[PDB]
Design a protein around this ligand. Sequence first.
Ligand SMILES: *[C@@H]1O[C@H](CO)[C@@H](O)[C@H](O)[C@H]1NC(C)=O
Ligand SMILES: C[N+](C)(C)CCOC(N)=O
Ligand SMILES: C[N+](C)(C)CCOC(N)=O
Lengths: 404, 406, 427, 385, 368
Amino acid sequence: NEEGRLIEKLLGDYDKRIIPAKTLDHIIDVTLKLTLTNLISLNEKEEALTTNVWIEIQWNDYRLSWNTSEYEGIDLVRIPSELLWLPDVVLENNVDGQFEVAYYANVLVYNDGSMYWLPPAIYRSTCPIAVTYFPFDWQNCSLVFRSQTYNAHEVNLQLSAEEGEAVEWIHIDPEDFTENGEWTIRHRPAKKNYNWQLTKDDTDFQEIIFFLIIQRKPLFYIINIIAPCVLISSLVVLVYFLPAQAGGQKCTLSISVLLAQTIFLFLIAQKVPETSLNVPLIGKYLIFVMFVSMLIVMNCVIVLNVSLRTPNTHSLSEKIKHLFLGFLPKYLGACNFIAKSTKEQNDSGSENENWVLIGKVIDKACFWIALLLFSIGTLAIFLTGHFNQVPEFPFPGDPRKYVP
Amino acid sequence: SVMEDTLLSVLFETYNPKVRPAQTVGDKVTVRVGLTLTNLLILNEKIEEMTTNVFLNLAWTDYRLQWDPAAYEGIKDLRIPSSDVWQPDIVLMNNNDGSFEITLHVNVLVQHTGAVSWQPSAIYRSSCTIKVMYFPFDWQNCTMVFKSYTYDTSEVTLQHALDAKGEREVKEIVINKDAFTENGQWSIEHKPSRKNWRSDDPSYEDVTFYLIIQRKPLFYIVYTIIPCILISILAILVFYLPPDAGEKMSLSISALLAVTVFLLLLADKVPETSLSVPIIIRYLMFIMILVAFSVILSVVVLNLHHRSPNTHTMPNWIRQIFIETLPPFLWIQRPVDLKEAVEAIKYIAEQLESASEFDDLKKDWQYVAMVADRLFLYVFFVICSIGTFSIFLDASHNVPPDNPFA
Amino acid sequence: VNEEERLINDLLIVNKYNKHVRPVKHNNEVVNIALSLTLSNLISLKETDETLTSNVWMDHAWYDHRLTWNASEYSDISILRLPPELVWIPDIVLQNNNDGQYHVAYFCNVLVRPNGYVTWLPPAIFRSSCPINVLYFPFDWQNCSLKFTALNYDANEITMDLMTDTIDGKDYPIEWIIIDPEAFTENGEWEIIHKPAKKNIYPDKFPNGTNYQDVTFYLIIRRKPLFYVINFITPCVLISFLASLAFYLPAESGEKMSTAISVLLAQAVFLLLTSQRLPETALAVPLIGKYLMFIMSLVTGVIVNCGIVLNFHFRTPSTHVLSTRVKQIFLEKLPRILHMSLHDEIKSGIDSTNYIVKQIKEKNAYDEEVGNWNLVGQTIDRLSMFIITPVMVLGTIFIFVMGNFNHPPAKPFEGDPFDYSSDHPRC
Amino acid sequence: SEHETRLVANLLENYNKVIRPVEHHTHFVDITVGLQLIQLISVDEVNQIVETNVRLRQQWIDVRLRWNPADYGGIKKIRLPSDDVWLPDLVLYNNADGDFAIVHMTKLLLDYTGKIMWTPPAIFKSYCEIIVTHFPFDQQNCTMKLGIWTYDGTKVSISPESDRPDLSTFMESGEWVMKDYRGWKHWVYYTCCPDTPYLDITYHFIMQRIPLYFVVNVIIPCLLFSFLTGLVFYLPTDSGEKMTLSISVLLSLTVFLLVIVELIPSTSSAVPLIGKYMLFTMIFVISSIIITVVVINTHHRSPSTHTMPQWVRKIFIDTIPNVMFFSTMGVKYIAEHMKSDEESSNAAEEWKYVAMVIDHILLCVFMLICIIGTVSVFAGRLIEL
Amino acid sequence: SEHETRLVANLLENYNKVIRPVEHHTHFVDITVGLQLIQLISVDEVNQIVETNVRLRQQWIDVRLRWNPADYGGIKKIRLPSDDVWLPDLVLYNNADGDFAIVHMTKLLLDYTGKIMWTPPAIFKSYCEIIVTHFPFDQQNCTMKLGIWTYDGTKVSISPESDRPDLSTFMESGEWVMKDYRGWKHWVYYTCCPDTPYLDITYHFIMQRIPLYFVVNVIIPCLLFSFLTGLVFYLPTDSGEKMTLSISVLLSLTVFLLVIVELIPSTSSAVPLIGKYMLFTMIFVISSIIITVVVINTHHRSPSTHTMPQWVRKIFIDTIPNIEGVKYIAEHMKSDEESSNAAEEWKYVAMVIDHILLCVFMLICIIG
Ligand SMILES: *[C@@H]1O[C@H](CO)[C@@H](O)[C@H](O)[C@H]1NC(C)=O
Ligand SMILES: C[N+](C)(C)CCOC(N)=O
Ligand SMILES: C[N+](C)(C)CCOC(N)=O
């Protein structure tokens, strides 16, 4: 095998601790190309994005150059990466301590010194979760690659080119790509970025950022959380048709609705990050419906108080009686002692009937008010959750699309 | 210079740790394998994995590590780094995680006759299949399988470790009286050891150490069984409550909710394997069915109580069964201008008489309801008592065998 | 130039230092390793996992005659710092640990003096396994241990022993865990009552087996229960009082059972939340758990009694008779003891009036019977209250006083009169 | 052994582990790869990961390691550390947790003809997309894709040992049953290297979940609460406690919905049958509660302010024959007042009667709906054959 | 380059990384140490552990690693790997779960004058005793204590780079905001080594929690239930549903108290103000339940067996508000009227008590 002689010739006077600069002031052009195989997950609690990628780092090492005529026309050999100098390209925005790649595959080196390294990696990048429109939200995550050791006077990070066109995207490979399910990739641009707060000798002056703009598919959440929550919260307006005559259990129904809404709030908290910069849209809806339910509990207490008033404890003045009976509903739509006892009980019965009529009028009016309020709130919340789509362009000011 | 340094220099001048110590081609290195359990850490039933702290008492003979103590100032034994000598890859093939080899790698002891003895310590997460029946009154049988990963019967011969004296051979897990802490949840009923062979391939041999451990069922009795017994008592009490007091549902469905909460908070203590249903979960199923039927029969009793002759007419068979047939058995025996004024009194007297007959019919319906309520009370009491007693009796009958069957 | 390079080259290279040989002049001689522990921070004690996670500094001291030099011959080198991978170190390991961490976390350099004295102070994060005694939880004190052993050599080759300090010319063993005031953070949940240290020798074993000697550091730590008291005990007692006084609710209102049932549900909730904050061990039932079991049983009895009262209240003469004994007991005796506070047409009309009066009389008799039943029910309610509330209060007081009286022993060991305190060295 | 010591010294003298074992660089190394599944450690549905304990047996011929047994005392097989010889670099393409390749690096058997037989262990925590449509009565088909990473098919060839992975010593899962398992070999062209095909082998397993645990722990209580919702109509509205039963069952179903949500993945590819059954049951409960409030309102409907229409009287008086059950097929002012009271009482009794009739009709229709709904939801997948 | 190859070969041919980089053993190798926070990964309150991502900048002069650029083709920087030169052993004394020292071992910049700058990253999981007195409005001040752990003041003489750690590239946490941050240098004497002062630097960060998440998830429902506490009194006792409402509110408050307990650590140093307020609300709920039971019993207190006290009928009624033709029915009607009047007086007493309790609750809400 001539590869043995070739490799023992190449790695003879070679050490991996020295950047292969031809002369003084010679910048090594290191170019990157990401390939997303599977968007494994977006863990909201840790605000982490776990992705399976193949990273392609390409450069030139003049020391590892030979003559094919002298080695039976060998123009490509694989050398373990541990035996070669590497540009030390790392993911800067990682949640854990994993900076470099996971596998450290072999490097393909060509006769002219071209170095092609394609290691796979599981990257747990960090990205703040904009939870304002959850679950109808889109997340704008990014992977930032820098050189951990060399600065802009030594290496030159660049995007890969194919036929003069620089690859400005993440290059989803049709052969080995898998959809994530809940997350769909709307945009995937790539861009070289500078800081301008550091001079070009600080190893953080230049970065290469791969942006993943993804959109959550909310059918699962709509079916399993929002729809049950709306259906349960719609029962709080049903309380106004229950009788107030020490039955029907208005308070029990309203309190049970409130408790169910609290359970749904806990369920939401069990799926939403603790970012605390903004309150989730579903969380805002839950708070709104809980407040409405508390107000309806107040209304039930007041109606039970009014409809159970007796002529003893309360006096029904004519100003209130006429107002709540003649105007609003139209807008809304030895026998001597026996006779005295019968009349005195009938008067109390009539007063109780008037009070329950007042209670029913209040029930109708407050039912219409609460129905309108709940419907408007639900429509507003789940219509501003809708009409919230991913921006048409990846970077908003730019007119470029960043697609193959 | 110390004679130990010279002895080490002479001993390892050409020694190669990568070659098996065979005096002649075709010889087998007999490796005695024993186990010393210092602490059975836990037995996680959720992942069916037993983690323990052990010492692996390995012994073999290396003919190259021989010398004459008389020529080295009486050095009869040496303690040398484990990585400088050959060693069998005695690993736990039964490990649940990826850890096969040793954690500690203590120094190996070599005698002047070549007898190498290595006793490295390790933390082993072995894979133990969990028999779900009878939990939490269970008796698990967790095996730890040790063998050379790379050497088969044609190269090494696994044997049982010897005792402190060389004449006796140990066939069981050695538990040091000192440095051993008994687990607060499991008790070691049997700890045998055995050499295992698999037929159809005469190149396989294991040393398997069996831990037959019996669970102490406390923290399960107290925290699940007794509260569920109290809930069952409430479910029985549901029937003695009168239908007129509107709290039969508030008690029965509350008991049902309590049982379901017990289920959902016990779901994180039982294995997810579905070969069978554990005794405690089966008892919870029984209690759920009993309480649900209590709710159904309470609804039936409430429906019977509020029936009226104006709305319902009592069938003949209902009266026959629930008036003069069952109450004897259940001891619920029933104990036993002037012209206008005249017309007014007669009408109200007739209305009172009609109301009295109506009340008599309504009381008949309520009596039927009460008789049915008492019958259901007795039936539920006997059914609950019999079921609970039978379930816990067969749970208590489950004990580990006497002959481990090694 | 620097003389340390020449000194190290002479000590380790010229002399052919072998780090795999005991620092002994000749065999059949022991290398004594002095051992000490310093508790920088008691990180946590997880009862569910039964683990003690502690931050310690583990000091070793010994002699290495090979690492000896003449100070005046090397321009007065007083101390030397050498990496552990270049010199022989005794491998002292924590034998009882839940995770596979036996050695120290960081292998700091070792300090050598011209007489051959070598000292090593590496830090460590140790997760030791100590059983948790939950008998008096949360007013409980735990007794955790850290056992260090030498598994690379037997007692005939190296001899572990406690490090010794010198006060006014007399040397005393440091038989306790050192707590440095400049580096120590109180846990805030556990208070160290006793911190002894012993060198254990097991005569049943042999000196040549590495099971012969141990060095054990004990931490007896008392839990400060204010957090657990405030956040679990007070709400539970307050809720139990509701079931205690549920008897005061009248039977006419259809909410007598509901209060007791809800209190029982709250007690079960507290029980199942407490069960998770303690190990799954069967050695003993927790004090708080036992109290809650007693309270739940009492509340169940209260629910049964309320059901009995309701049954006695709504029974009617149409179905249930009023026996003489029931009256003579409940209507009179118990309330005294408990100090409870024309032509034929007109003839038909007269007969109609007679029937009206007879029906009124029957209704009055029915009303008096149901009133007697209601009074019997109220009497049973008062009796149940006066028999249940005091026993509940007494049980709560007794249980919590017995728990609060649980104090750690004055001495850390039963048979040892000496108190392993830093203020009273034995010398 | 002195003979084996000499042999190992001689073999590992000019041997370079970097270089492939081919005699000529034009040739290729054909590695026979088989995977045996010792144990299915777990199937995490929420994270869509399968943890499996496997042995990745692989055999290949290394010419540089051959020797003559008669020279070295008749030794025909030795064992060498895997770090000393050239090793094929198998990588698990689909991967979520753990390393992509073999990390344990156990010893390997070397035959005197150069036949290396390296069988290292591994734990594959491989990503695999689960179909949650039929939960819990689902079968998951998912794979492990192992391939040579840095070498194309013209320099390193991988070949399956057999048509199916070896499950001779496979521990019974206790939660899944292996309906089928098979490995397929693919020549795939990637965008990196369009002119050379890369070889890989995908071993796919079909695992049918045993549903006994999930059924007992989740499904049975949900059926019980659905039955109770059907029952709630037989309760008389006069006793109260009807709303109590309804809300109790609603809260129970909410808790069980939370429990189920904690189990299944959040993917939206297909709605689980358990999720749609929960939604159906919750809609059932909401409809029961709404029509129950309607029944309660009609029962307590005032006989004075609400005159009973003629059509309701007709319908809910002639419906009873169609249903075969237990239902029925000063001196003057006091008299006048009580006559009016009894007339109003009878008028209210008419409303109570129509409410009872509606309750019976709803009870029948809701029992039928519950039975039909549960059968339609579950028998679709329960009938596998 | 070939010049850099020769330079690296010559620098390390007789270089011993064991020995300190000092010309004379009596001197100290001064080290400038600075911290650069990158992201506050987490603050686990229950375990009191703060996980941060940091970069530890260390600069020192290595005399042996000096060269003349004119000889080696004008080269002035090398960028050597750290595992080849002497490295100061900075140890995080507060470690709670993780490594005490640097484990990444990245490359370091090496100037031609011997100056070395090394900026390794690290994930510090340090111990953080959290003051839980205020919550969820707490302010946490916990430090990172970096020492040298092997040498004393006359050997390495550590020094701080700047008065404050560098936060020029700090990613915003979202859950916490940085109020202040500063590093202090200390000379400490330990029981090990009483005659030699060991140097260290403690960097402390003051983090103010953003309470929006916890406010929404706890305080708002707790405030709703606390407001529902007072609706019991306005609820008539005739309707029932009074004990049900009170008990539901109490159980909700207990559940939220348990949630708060799960959130806060189990330390007994101080009771959280939110926990104290929750306990006080529970006390108020219990008192309201007791008063409600008393009011229910008063409302249902039949006069057939219970007489009406005189002082109650004074205060709560006056001061706080401001032969077959026998007529057997007339006398019983009069007696029933008297009993109904006494029962109505009981109803009025119950209503007055309810209104007084409602006014008390309204005053409490106003003052709160
Ligand atoms: C490469 O080989 C060819 C043919 O042998 C020769 O002409 C050419 O000069 C060689 N180049 C180098 C750089 O060796
Ligand atoms: C095989 N593949 C395409 C997944 C990775 C190839 O990487 C190289 N060529 O080294
Ligand atoms: C001083 N101290 C305790 C922080 C470190 C001690 O380590 C030594 N000097 O060996």
